[PDB]
Amino acid sequence: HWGYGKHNGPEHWHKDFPIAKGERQSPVDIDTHTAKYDPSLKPLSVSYDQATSLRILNNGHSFKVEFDDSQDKAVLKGGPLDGTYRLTQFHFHWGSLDGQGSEHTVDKKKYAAELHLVHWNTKYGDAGKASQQPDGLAVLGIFLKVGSAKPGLQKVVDVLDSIKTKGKSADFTNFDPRGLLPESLDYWTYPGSLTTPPLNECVTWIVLKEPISVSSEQVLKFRKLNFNGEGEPEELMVDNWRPAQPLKNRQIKASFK
Ligand SMILES: NS(=O)(=O)c1c(F)c(F)c(S(=O)(=O)CCO)c(N[C@H](c2ccccc2)[C@@H](O)c2ccccc2)c1F
Ligand SMILES: [Zn+2]
């Protein structure tokens, strides 16, 4: 099946998912100098106060924390969005070393990791149906640089030893995703896709300008996860990022400057 290695990695995905070479694929390089400031864009509304995390799982591609999205509890609205998007999960992409790991890049700069908070448009009723629509999903992307620790990430890092291999999961309640956000909500936005198969072109990307800093010890815990199930050969889960794809006929908009 698909993955991130030489024989089944991003350059191979188009064979099973031909949209991989489509007109609105993600991630992209964000050219800060040619993004267009749009003074008409609204501030992003991030209403995470009633978030209810439920579980964390290693799916053999990343790890993900899943939320109760059966009611409006943790939602994203405003910015470039029409209507209300419900948070369903977050996950990360990261590198084998600190100089790569992010999917979006900024002026060709790669971060050590990128956090994706995935939300679905409540007019579509569920994430599956939303994934089939051009305005189905909004993904809030946040870059991680290595430096000071992020205290609000610690609860995540400390449970990862319990989900080392593909298919392991644990209950994971009362995690506050507000503790992963940087101070600023300034952002770039463009229309794109999921960055993993099936690569649906259904995402409004909102990528925050300000990275969060995480420590070396925090990212080192990510890199101890395994892609494999227990009892297959050990392959560390690292470099689970798709590289920048061509922008094609898109303009990236900025909320600032
Ligand atoms: N970088 S990305 O944001 O594009 C991305 C990922 F990188 C990613 F790893 C996942 S994943 O679910 O953790 C394993 C690969 O599916 C998902 N999950 C998909 C998803 C979850 C919740 C809501 C919408 C989409 C995936 O599970 C999916 C794909 C297609 C249709 C429904 C669900 C994902 F969206
Ligand atoms: Zn992602």
Swiss-Prot record:
Activity profile over pH: Optimum pH is 6-8.
E.C. numbers: 4.2.1.1, 4.2.1.69
Domain Alpha-carbonic anhydrase: 1-256
Site (Fine-tunes the proton-transfer properties of H-64): 4, 59, 64
Chain residues that bind Zn(2+): 91, 93, 116
Consequence recorded when altering residue 116 to D/N/Q: Reduced activity
InterPro entries reported for this sequence: CA_dom, CA_dom_sf, Carbonic_anhydrase_a-class, Carbonic_anhydrase_a-class_CS
Activity regulation annotation text: Activated by X-ray, histamine, L-adrenaline, L- and D-phenylalanine, L- and D-histidine, L-His-OMe and beta-Ala-His (carnosine).
Outcome (variant: residue 91 to C/D/E/N/Q): Strongly reduced CO(2) hydrase and p-nitrophenyl acetate esterase activities, impaired stability of zinc binding
Variant or mutagenesis effect after changing residue 141 to R: In OPTB3; complete loss of activity
Site (Involved in the binding of some activators, including histamine and L-histidine): 89
Residue(s) carrying Phosphoserine: 162, 169
Annotated phenotype, changing residue 89 to P: In OPTB3; in Czechoslovakia
Effect after changing residue 198 to A: Normal CO(2) hydrase activity, but impaired stability
Enzyme's top EC category: lyase
GO cellular component, one term: myelin sheath
Clinical disorder: Osteopetrosis, autosomal recessive 3: A rare genetic disease characterized by abnormally dense bone, due to defective resorption of immature bone. Osteopetrosis occurs in two forms: a severe autosomal recessive form occurring in utero, infancy, or childhood, and a benign autosomal dominant form occurring in adolescence or adulthood. Recessive osteopetrosis commonly manifests in early infancy with macrocephaly, feeding difficulties, evolving blindness and deafness, bone marrow failure, severe anemia, and hepatosplenomegaly.
Subunit relationships: Interacts with SLC4A4. Interaction with SLC4A7 regulates SLC4A7 transporter activity. Interacts with SLC26A6 isoform 4 (via C-terminus cytoplasmic domain).
Described function: Catalyzes the reversible hydration of carbon dioxide. Can also hydrate cyanamide to urea. Stimulates the chloride-bicarbonate exchange activity of SLC26A6. Essential for bone resorption and osteoclast differentiation. Involved in the regulation of fluid secretion into the anterior chamber of the eye. Contributes to intracellular pH regulation in the duodenal upper villous epithelium during proton-coupled peptide absorption.
Protein name: Carbonic anhydrase 2
Annotated organism of origin: Homo sapiens
Gene label: CA2
